[PDB]
Short mmCIF file of C-alpha atoms and ligand atoms in Angstrom, two decimals:
data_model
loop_
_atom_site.label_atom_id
_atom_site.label_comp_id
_atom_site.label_asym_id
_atom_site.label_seq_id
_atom_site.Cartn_x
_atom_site.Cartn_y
_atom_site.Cartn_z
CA UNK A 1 84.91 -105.82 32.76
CA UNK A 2 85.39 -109.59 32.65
CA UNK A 3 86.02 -111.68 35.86
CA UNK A 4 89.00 -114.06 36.87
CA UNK A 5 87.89 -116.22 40.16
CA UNK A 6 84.21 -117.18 41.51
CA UNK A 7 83.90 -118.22 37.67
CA UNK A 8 84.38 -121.90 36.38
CA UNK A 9 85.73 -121.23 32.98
CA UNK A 10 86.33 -125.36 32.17
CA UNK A 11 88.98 -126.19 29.93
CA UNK A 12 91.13 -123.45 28.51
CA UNK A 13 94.39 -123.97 25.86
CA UNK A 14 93.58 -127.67 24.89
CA UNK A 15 95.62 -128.53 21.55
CA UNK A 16 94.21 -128.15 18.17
CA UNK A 17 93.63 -131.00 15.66
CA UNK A 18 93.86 -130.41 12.06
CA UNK A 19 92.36 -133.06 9.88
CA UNK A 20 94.83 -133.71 6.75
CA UNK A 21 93.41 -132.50 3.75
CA UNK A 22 92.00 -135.56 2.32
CA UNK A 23 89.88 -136.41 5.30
CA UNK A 24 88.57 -132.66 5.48
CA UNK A 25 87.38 -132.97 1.72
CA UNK A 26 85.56 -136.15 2.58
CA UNK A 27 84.04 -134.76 5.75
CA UNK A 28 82.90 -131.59 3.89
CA UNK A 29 81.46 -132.95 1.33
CA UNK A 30 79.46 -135.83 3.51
CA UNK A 31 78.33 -132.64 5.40
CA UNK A 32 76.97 -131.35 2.49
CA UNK A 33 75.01 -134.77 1.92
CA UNK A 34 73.83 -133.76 5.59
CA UNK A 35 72.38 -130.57 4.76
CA UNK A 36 71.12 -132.10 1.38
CA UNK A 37 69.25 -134.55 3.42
CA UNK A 38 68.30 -132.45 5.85
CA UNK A 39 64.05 -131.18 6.66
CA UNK A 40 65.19 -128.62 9.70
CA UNK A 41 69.05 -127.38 9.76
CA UNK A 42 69.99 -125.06 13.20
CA UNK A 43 73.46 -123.82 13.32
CA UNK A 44 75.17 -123.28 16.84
CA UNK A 45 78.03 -120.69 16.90
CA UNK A 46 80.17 -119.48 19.21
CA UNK A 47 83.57 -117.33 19.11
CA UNK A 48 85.47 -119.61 16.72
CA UNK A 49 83.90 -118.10 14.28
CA UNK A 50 84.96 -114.30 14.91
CA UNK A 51 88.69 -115.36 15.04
CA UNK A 52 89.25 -114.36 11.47
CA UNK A 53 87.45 -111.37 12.05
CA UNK A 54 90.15 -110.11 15.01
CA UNK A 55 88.08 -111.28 18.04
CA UNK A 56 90.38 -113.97 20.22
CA UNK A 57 87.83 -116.47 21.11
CA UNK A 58 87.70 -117.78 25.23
CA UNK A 59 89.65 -121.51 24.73
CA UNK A 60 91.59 -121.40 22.56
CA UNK A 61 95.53 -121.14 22.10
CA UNK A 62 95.23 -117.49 22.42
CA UNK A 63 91.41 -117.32 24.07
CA UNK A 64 90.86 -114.79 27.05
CA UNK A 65 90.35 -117.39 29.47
CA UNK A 66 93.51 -119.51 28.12
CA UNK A 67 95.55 -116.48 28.39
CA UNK A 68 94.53 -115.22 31.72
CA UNK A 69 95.23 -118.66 33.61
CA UNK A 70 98.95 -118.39 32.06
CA UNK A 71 98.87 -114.27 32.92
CA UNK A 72 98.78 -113.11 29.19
CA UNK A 73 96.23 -110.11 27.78
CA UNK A 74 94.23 -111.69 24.67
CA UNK A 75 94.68 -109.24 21.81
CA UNK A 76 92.57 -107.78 19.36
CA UNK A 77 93.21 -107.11 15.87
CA UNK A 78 89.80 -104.94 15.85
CA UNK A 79 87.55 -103.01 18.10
CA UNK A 80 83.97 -104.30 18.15
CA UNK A 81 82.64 -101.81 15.64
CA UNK A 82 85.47 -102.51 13.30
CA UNK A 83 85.01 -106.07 12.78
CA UNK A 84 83.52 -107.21 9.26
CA UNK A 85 81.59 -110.72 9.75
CA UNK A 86 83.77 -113.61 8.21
CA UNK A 87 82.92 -115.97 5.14
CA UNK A 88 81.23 -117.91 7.63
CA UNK A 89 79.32 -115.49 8.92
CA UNK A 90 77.88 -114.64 5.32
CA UNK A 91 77.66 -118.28 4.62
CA UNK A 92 75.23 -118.51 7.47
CA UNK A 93 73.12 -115.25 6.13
CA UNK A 94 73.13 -117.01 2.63
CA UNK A 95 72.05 -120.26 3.89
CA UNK A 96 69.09 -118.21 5.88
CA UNK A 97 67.88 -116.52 2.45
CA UNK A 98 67.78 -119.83 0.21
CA UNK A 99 65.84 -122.05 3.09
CA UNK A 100 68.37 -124.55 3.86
CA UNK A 101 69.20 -122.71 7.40
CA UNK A 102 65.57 -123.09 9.64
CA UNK A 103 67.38 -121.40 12.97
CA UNK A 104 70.72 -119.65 14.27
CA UNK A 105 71.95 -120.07 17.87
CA UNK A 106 75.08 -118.04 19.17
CA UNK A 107 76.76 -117.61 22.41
CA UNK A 108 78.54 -114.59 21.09
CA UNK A 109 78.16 -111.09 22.33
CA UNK A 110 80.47 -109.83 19.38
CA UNK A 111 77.47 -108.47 17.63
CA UNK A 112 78.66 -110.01 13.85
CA UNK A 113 75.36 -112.27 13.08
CA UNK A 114 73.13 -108.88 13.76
CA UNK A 115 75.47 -106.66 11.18
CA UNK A 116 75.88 -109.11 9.06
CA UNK A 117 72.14 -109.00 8.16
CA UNK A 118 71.31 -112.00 9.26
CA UNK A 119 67.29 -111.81 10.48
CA UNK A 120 67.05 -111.15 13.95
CA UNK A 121 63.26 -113.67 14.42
CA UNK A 122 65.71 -116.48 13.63
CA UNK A 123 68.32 -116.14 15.42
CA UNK A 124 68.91 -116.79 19.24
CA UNK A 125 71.61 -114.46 21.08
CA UNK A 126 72.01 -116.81 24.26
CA UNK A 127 74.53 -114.47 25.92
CA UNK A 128 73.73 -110.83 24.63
CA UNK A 129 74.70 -108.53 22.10
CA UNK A 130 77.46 -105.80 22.41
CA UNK A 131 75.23 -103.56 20.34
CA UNK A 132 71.90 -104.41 21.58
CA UNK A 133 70.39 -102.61 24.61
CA UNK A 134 67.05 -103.15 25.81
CA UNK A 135 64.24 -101.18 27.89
CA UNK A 136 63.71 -102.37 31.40
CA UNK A 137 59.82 -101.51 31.15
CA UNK A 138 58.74 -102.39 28.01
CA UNK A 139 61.49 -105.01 27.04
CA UNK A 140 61.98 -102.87 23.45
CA UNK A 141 65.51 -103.58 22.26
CA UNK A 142 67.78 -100.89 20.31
CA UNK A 143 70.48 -101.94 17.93
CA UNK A 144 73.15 -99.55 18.22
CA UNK A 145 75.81 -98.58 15.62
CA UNK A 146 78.74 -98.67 18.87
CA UNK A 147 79.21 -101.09 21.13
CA UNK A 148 76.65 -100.13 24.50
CA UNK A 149 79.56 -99.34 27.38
CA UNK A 150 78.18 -101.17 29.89
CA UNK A 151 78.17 -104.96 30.99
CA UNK A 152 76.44 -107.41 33.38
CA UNK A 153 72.13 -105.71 32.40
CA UNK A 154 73.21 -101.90 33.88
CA UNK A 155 71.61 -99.20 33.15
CA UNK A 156 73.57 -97.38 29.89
CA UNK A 157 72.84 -93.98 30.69
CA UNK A 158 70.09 -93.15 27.46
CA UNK A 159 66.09 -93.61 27.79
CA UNK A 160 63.54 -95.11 25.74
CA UNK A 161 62.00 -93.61 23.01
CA UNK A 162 58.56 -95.74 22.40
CA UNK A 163 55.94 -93.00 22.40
CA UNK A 171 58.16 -94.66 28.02
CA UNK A 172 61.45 -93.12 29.08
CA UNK A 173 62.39 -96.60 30.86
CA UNK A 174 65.50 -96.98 31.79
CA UNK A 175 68.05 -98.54 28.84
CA UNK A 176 70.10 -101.57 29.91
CA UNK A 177 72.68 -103.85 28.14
CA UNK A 178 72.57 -107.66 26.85
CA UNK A 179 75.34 -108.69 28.40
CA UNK A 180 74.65 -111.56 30.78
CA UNK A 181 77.12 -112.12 33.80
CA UNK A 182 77.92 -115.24 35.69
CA UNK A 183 74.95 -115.65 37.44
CA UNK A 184 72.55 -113.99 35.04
CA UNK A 185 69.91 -115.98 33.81
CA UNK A 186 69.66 -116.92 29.56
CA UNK A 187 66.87 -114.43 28.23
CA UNK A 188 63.82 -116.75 27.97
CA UNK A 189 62.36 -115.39 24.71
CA UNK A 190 65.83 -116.72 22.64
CA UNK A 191 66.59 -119.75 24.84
CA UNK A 192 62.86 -121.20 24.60
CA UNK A 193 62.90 -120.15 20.61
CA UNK A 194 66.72 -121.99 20.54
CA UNK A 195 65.30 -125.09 22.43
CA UNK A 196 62.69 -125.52 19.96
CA UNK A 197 64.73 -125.10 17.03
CA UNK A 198 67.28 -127.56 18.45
CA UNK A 199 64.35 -130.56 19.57
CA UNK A 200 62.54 -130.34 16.51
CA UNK A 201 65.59 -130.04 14.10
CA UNK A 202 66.91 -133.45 12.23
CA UNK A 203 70.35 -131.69 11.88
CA UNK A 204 72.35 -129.51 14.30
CA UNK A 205 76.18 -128.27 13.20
CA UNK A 206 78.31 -126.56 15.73
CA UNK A 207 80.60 -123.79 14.67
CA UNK A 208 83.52 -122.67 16.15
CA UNK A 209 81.85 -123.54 20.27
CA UNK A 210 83.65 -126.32 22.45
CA UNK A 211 80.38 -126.60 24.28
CA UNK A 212 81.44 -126.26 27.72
CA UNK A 213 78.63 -123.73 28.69
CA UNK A 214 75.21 -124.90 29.72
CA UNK A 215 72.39 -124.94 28.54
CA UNK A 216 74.38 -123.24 25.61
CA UNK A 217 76.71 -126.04 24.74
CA UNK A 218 73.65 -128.83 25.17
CA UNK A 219 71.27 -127.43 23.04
CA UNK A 220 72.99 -129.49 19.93
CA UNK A 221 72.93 -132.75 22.15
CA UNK A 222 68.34 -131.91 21.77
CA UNK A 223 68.60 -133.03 18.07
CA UNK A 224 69.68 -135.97 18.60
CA UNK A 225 66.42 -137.31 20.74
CA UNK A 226 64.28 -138.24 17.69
CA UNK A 227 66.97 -139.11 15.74
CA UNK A 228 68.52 -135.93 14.74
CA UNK A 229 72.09 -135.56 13.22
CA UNK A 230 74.97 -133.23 15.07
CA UNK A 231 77.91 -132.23 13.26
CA UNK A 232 81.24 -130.70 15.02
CA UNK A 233 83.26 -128.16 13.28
CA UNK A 234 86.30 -127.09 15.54
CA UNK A 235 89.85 -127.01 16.09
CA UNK A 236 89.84 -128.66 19.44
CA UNK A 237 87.95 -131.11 21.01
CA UNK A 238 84.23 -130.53 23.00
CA UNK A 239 82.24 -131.35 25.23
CA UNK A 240 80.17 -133.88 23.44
CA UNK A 241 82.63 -134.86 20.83
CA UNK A 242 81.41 -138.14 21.69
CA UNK A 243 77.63 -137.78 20.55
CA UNK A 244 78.68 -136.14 17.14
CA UNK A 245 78.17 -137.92 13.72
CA UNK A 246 80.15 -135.83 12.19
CA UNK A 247 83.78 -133.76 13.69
CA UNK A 248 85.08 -131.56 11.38
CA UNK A 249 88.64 -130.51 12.52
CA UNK A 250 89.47 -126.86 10.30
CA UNK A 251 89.20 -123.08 10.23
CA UNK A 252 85.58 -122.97 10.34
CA UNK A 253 85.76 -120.07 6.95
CA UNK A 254 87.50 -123.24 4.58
CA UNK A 255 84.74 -125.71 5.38
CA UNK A 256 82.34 -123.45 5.07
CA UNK A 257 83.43 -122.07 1.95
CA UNK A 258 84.04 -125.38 0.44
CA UNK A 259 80.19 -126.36 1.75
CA UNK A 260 79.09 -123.46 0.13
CA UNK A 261 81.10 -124.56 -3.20
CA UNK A 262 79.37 -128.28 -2.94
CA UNK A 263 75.76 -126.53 -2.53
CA UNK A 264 76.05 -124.52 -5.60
CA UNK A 265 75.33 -121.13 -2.98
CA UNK A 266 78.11 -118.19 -3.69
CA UNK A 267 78.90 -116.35 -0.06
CA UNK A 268 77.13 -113.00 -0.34
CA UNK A 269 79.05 -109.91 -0.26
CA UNK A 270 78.81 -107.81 3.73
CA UNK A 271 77.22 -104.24 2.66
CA UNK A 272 78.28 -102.93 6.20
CA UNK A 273 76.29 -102.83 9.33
CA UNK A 274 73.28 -103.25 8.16
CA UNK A 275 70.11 -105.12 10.39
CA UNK A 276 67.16 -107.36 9.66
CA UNK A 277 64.36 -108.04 12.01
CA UNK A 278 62.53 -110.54 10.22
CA UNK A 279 63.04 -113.25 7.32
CA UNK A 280 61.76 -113.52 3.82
CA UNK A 281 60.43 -115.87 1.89
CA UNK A 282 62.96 -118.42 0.93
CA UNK A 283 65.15 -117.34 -2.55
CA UNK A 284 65.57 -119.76 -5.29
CA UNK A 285 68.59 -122.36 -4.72
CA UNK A 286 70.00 -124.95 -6.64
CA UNK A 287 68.16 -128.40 -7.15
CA UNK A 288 69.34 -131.24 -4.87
CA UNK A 289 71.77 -134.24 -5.94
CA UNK A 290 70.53 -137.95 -6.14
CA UNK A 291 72.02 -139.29 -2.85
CA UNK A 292 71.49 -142.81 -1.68
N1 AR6 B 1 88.75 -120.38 12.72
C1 AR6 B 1 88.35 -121.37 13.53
N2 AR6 B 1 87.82 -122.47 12.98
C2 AR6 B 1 87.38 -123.46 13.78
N3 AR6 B 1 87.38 -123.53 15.10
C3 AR6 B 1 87.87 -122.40 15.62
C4 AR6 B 1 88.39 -121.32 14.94
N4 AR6 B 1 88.84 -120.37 15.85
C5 AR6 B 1 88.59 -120.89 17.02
N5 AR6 B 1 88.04 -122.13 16.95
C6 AR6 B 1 87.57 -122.95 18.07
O1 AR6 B 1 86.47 -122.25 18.58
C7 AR6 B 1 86.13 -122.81 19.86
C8 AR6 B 1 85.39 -121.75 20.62
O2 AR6 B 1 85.26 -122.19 21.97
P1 AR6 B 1 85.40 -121.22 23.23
O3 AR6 B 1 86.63 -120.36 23.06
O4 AR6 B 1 85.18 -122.09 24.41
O5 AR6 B 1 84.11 -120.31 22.99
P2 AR6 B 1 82.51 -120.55 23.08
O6 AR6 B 1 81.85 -119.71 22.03
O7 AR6 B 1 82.29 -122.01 23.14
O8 AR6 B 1 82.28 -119.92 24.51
C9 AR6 B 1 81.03 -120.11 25.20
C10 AR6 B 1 80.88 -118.99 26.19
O9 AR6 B 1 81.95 -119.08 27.15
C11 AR6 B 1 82.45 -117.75 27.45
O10 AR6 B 1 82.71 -117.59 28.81
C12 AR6 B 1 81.39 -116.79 26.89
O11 AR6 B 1 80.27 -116.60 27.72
C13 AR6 B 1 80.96 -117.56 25.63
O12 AR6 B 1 79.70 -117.13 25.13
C14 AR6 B 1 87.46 -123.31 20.44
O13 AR6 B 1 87.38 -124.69 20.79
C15 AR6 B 1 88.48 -123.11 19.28
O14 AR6 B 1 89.32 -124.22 19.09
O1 ISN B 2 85.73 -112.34 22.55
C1 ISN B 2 85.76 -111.61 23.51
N1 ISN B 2 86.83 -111.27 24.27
C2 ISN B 2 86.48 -110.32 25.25
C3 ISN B 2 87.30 -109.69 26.17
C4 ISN B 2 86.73 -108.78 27.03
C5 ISN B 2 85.37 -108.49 26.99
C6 ISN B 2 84.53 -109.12 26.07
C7 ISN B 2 85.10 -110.04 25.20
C8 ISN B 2 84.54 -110.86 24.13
O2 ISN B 2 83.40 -110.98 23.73
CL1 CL B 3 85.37 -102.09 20.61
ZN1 ZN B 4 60.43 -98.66 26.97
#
């Protein structure tokens, strides 16, 4: 359930760059002098980074939207439920738990952040949550274990269970719906007031989605790009990092000392901890 027409879907199929090896070590490794130097560090992701989990992303060579326009079906390697979060996705959880990650912000429904563990109070689902239904009445969200069968904030069929019986409705927003204020307010925030924003595997075509990054830079911030093709604000980045989104941020991980924690299953966090110890910082200037 997924539209073709009234929908702008902006530009689908453009052609990947790869950065030759040497470049992508340098660019790594000054992103890791980034993070180093870095107060406030939000992370924007988007479906780039659920490729090497089986999820076709929207843009790319094989994206839905790129695939539709040239009347191909994207394919799945994995249902929904299936999917194990990549190395990046437990890079981001491991960046969360040792302080150097202040906020998450994802345009994916895919549900991967949530089961990866990653706490729920800092991260920002801007488009909804295949898992994730929520009561009409009292606004009290469910996690499910399978993916909730509807789309476009229908009722699901099941009830609340607050000691309510409201009617249960999905976190999938349509076209025309509306980003949930709560998360887009919280992801605004993060983004102003952070002095680093890196992009993940989004071309940034979606508003307010795709701006949010562009916030940091008012005050000063640093934005760093990590994708295969070009986006929207290529322009305004300091940084473009051309790669598979699960090398550079395993070879991040590598220059910060932080291993990538192993995925225990579906397994979901509401709120963060305390920081956990982490490596002291190199001497950089
Ligand atoms: N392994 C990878 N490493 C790096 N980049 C990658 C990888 N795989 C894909 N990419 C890049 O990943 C990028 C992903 O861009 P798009 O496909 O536009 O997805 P969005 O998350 O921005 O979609 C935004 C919304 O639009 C939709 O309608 C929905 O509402 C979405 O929520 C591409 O440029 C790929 O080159
Ligand atoms: O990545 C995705 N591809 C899709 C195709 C159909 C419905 C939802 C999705 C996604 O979230
Ligand atoms: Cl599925
Ligand atoms: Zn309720």
């Amino acid at each position: 359930g997924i539209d073709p027409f009234t929908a702008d879907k902006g530009k689908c199929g453009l052609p990947e760059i790869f950065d030759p090896p040497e470049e992508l070590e340098r660019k790594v490794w000054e992103l890791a002098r980034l993070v180093w130097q870095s107060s406030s560090v939000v992370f924007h992701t988007g479906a780039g980074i659920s490729t090497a989990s089986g999820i076709p992303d929207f843009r790319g060579p094989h994206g839905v939207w790129t695939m539709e326009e040239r009347g191909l079906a994207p394919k799945f390697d994995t249902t929904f439920e299936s999917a194990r979060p990549t190395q990046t996705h437990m890079a981001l959880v491991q960046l969360e738990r040792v302080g150097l990650l202040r906020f998450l912000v994802s345009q994916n429904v895919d549900g991967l952040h949530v089961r990866s563990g990653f706490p729920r109070d800092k991260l920002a689902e801007l488009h909804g949550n295949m898992f994730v239904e929520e009561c009409a009445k009292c606004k009290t969200q469910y996690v499910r274990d399978t993916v909730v069968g509807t789309m476009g904030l229908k009722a699901t069929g099941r009830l609340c269970t607050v000691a309510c019986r409201g009617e249960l409705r999905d976190t999938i927003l349509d076209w025309e719906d509306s980003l949930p204020d709560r998360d887009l307010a919280l992801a605004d925030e993060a983004s102003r007031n952070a002095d680093l924003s890196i992009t993940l595997g989004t071309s940034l075509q979606i508003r307010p989605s795709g701006n949010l990054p562009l916030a940091t830079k008012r005050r000063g911030g640093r934005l760093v790009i990590v994708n295969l093709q070009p986006t929207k604000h290529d322009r305004h980045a300091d940084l473009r990092i051309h790669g598979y989104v699960d090398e550079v941020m395993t070879r991040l991980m590598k220059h910060l000392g932080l291993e990538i924690p192993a995925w225990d299953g579906p397994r979901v966090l509401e709120r963060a901890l305390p920081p956990l110890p982490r490596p002291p910082t190199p001497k950089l200037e």
